[PDB]
């Protein structure tokens, strides 16, 4: 317990040497240690960034994080790291075990001193943005804000992660172009969602586009909407090719029979008010 002194390193400015004398002289030392690797805007190793700092057991996690520029930090996760030792009184010091300096020594010193603490070295690893909140989800999926988004929630709806949010979003704003890019991926909850919408609001232009997408392949989802809409709106003029009001017959001009009425014969080009089986035949004539 005497002549504590901090000797400069030969090369790494972060690296230093801690010299010391003792009441028992056999414990004399020249310990190599590093501290405060500069704040990083880049990576230590492939996909990795390891600050030159020992996180003593019980020390706050953020102390590892203090040596990374916060923008560059958003991507990286902190995982476990290899055992290291530190000087309690100067906690966060990385002791290097070289030569005379040996694990025995250190085990022993601790037994005799409270000048030794231990922990794990800071090991960061690259993944992607974390996104822990509902609004964060809504922003990414809707594309009202895209900047700090992971690929899973920002791939133009290629994967399905956004379908839950877009289910509710698009019910409200069916005309939203992004709701339409979403629907264009033709996965079942989008198509289903628009069958519900158009069953109520077929007359909207977005329902035109709805029909335009789902055909040819997923036509049933349009037929379903046409059926219900025209069931719910008997007063609408555009319905009478699909549900013609003779009490016995609303099936009168379905399928092959569609070419019989002059109205349903192409007048306007509006596919949506004729069922798929129907407007197939319109052209066939």
């Amino acid at each position: 317990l005497n002549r504590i002194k901090i000797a400069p390193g030969i090369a790494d400015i972060r690296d230093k040497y801690m010299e010391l004398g003792f009441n028992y002289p056999e414990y004399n030392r020249a310990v190599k240690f590093a501290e405060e690797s500069y704040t990083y805007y880049y990576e230590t190793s492939p996909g990795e960034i390891k600050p030159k700092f020992c996180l003593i057991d019980g020390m706050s996690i953020d102390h590892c994080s203090s040596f990374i520029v916060p923008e560059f930090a958003k991507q990286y996760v902190l995982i476990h790291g290899e055992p290291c030792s530190s000087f309690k009184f100067r906690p966060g010091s990385l002791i290097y075990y070289q030569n005379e300096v040996t694990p025995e020594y250190i085990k022993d010193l601790k037994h005799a001193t409270d000048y030794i603490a231990s922990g794990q070295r800071c090991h960061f690893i690259k993944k992607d943005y974390l996104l822990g909140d509902s609004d964060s989800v809504a922003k990414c999926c809707s594309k009202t804000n895209t900047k700090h988004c992971p690929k899973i929630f920002n791939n133009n709806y290629k994967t399905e992660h956004c379908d839950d949010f877009m289910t509710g979003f698009c019910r409200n704003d069916p005309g939203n172009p992004n709701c339409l890019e979403w629907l264009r991926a033709k996965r079942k909850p989008a198509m289903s969602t628009y069958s519900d919408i158009c069953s109520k609001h077929m007359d909207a232009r977005y329902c035109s586009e709805f029909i335009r997408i789902i055909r040819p392949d997923y036509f049933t989802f349009g037929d379903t909407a046409l059926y219900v809409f025209c069931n719910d709106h008997k007063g609408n003029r555009n319905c009478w090719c699909a549900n013609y009001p003779k009490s016995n017959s609303g099936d009168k001009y379905l399928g092959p029979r569609v070419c019989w009425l002059h109205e349903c014969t192409d007048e306007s080009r509006d596919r949506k008010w004729l069922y798929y089986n129907q407007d197939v035949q319109r052209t066939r004539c």
């Binding site: 504590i4 996690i61 902190l78 993944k127 079942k188 198509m191 289903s192 379905l254 399928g255 092959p256």
Partner: protein, 261 residues
């Protein structure tokens, strides 16, 4: 005496600030084997989070309680997944199922693109074949079963198997609104094979069916012999065919109806 240095002040990251209480919209849409990071989690919270997200394994990713959930399964049920295209998950509490998240509830997640896999085929075959029929759902199911043609081996066998099962069923009585939709979609397929299958199914129908439903295709001879006289097809005038339900016409008759003016 000691040359003391206090550590540089801590500056956290997003991961460190994350809170699983806020993360249900983040966690539910996660896929199998995708590590969903959730922030430091205290030990006395681990059970709540394991309760809520039973399809996930709870993992410790790092120091200070840093943690993640790793999806292991989709344990949502056919009754709740198959009878809807609406929803990919539901939250369960006290024997009840709610679309919206409630605290205390346990999340169950539906298998992705499940209808294209054919794992709903045994449920809907039952469900749609009864008074449990939901027209919209049940039509949709048959529509999209056809679309599995260009997809996956699993979905193509599905398609095949179901098609076999539906042939045998609808031969018995093609009136049952499920078999009406089946025929409707064969017509939409519009190949030799879909046509001759319709004729095959239709040609096995019962005594009453044909007189109740296929008078256009099975005219009385008095009717039939008038048709010979005119170069217009019978169908273009025969009152039995203007009325008739197109899903029960044979192909010839179905074809012919299109040729009039």
């Amino acid at each position: 005496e000691l040359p003391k240095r206090d550590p540089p002040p801590g500056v956290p990251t997003d991961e460190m600030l994350l809170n699983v209480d806020k993360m249900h919209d983040v966690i539910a849409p996660a896929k199998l084997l995708e590590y969903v990071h959730i922030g430091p989690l205290a030990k006395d919270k681990e059970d709540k989070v394991k309760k809520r997200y039973p399809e996930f394994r709870l993992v410790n990713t790092g120091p200070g309680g840093l943690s993640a959930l790793l999806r292991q399964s989709y344990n949502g049920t056919a009754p709740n997944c198959c009878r809807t295209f609406n929803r990919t998950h539901y939250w369960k509490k006290d024997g009840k199922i709610s679309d919206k998240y409630e605290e205390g509830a346990v999340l169950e997640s539906c298998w992705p693109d499940v209808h294209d896999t054919g794992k709903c085929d045994v449920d809907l075959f039952d469900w749609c074949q009864g008074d449990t029929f939901d027209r919209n759902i049940c039509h949709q199911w048959i529509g999209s079963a056809f679309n599995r043609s260009n997809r996956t081996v699993e979905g193509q066998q599905s398609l095949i198997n179901l098609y076999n099962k539906m042939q045998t069923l609808c031969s018995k009585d093609a009136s049952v609104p499920i078999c009406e939709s089946f025929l409707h979609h064969l017509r939409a397929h519009n190949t030799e094979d879909s046509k001759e299958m319709i004729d095959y199914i239709l040609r096995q129908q019962s005594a009453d069916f044909k007189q109740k439903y296929m008078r256009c295709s099975y005219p009385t001879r008095d009717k039939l012999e008038e048709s010979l006289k005119y170069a217009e097809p019978r169908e273009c005038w025969d009152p039995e065919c203007s009325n008739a339900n197109v899903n029960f016409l044979l192909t010839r008759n179905y074809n012919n109806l299109g040729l009039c003016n």
